[PDB]
């Protein structure tokens, strides 16, 4: 399958959890995170960072008795992947294409929502600098 679509497959998603700290004895294992749609996106700063592949919600701060599904419902109730009940292979191509369109939309929405935030931050700085000149300063 093309790389673009691999995140739709659980075994791919599991394979992302390279150094996941929570393992057996825990509620949020790699298996269970992946069943819930998450992938592992670690960084230097947020080493337990995980992201829904579908709605792109990013969650860190994971505790061991967290149920990844219950967490995904709480933090991103809108996510259509939570509605999906059939296994990947039991999907029709129509249904699958419908979903991938919804994912592309979510992705765009997220990128858009970031740009707005960066911009609003930049505007704040510019405004401030101008206010400071107007102070006679």
């Amino acid at each position: 399958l093309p790389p673009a679509w691999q995140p739709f497959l659980k075994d791919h998603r599991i394979s992302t959890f390279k150094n996941w700290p929570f393992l057996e004895g825990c509620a949020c294992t790699p298996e269970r995170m992946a069943e819930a749609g998450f992938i592992h996106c670690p960084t230097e700063n947020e080493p337990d960072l995980a992201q829904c592949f579908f709605c792109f919600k990013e969650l860190e701060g994971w505790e061991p008795d967290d149920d990844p599904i219950e967490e995904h419902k709480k933090h991103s109730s809108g996510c259509a992947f939570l509605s999906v009940k059939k296994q990947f292979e039991e999907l029709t191509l129509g249904e699958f294409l419908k979903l991938d369109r919804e994912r592309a939309k979510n992705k765009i929405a997220k990128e858009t929502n970031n740009k707005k935030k960066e911009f609003e931050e930049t505007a704040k700085k510019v405004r401030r600098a101008i206010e400071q000149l107007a102070a006679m300063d």
């Binding site: 947020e46 960072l49 919600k57 990013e58 969650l59 860190e60 967290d66 967490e71 933090h75």
Partner: peptide
């Protein structure tokens, strides 16, 4: 667990 920042 909690959102990014």
């Amino acid at each position: 667990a909690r959102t990014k920042q």
